[PDB]
Design a protein around this nucleic acid. Sequence first.
DNA 1: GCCATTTTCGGCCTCTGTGAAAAACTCCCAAAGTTCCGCTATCAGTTAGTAAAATGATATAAATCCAAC
Length: 110
Amino acid sequence: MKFILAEKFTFDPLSNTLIDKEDSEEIIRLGSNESRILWLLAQRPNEVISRNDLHDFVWREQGFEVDDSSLTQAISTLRKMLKDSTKSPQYVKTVPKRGYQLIARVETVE
DNA sequence: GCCATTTTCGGCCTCTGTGAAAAACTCCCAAAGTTCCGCTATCAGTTAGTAAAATGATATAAATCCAAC
């Protein structure tokens, strides 16, 4: 099933592609880790998810263990490639001591 | 040269513990000490972020080599 974020981007959890409607010619390529993190965010629309829980769901299914700086770097690359605001709450933000938040709307294509 | 008064010495080791008298108050003033509170510096504890380096994984190109005709 394909998801639409903030009526602007479209993304699918199964093929890991991003499409911007403003520039439909340029497909945006994302890494597997950030794509799975964003999909997990989309599964829970706009409610807080713990850093610990999202981290362990993303990487323990991968079969291997990494430090928690990897999560921060993945979110940094997610915000950078999406051209989301550096620290304003436009699409994705970080809520301290509680976890991570998404602001973009969820539109299931099918 | 001779009294006549001072000065100077008198063994080594070992344990040992000393409190033991003695009688004024009063007023004024300045500085140190005690305490409380506020500001400031300094550090542990924690979280998150961004750019870059490091490292591994995959990709792309050949060497050659081995089996079948």
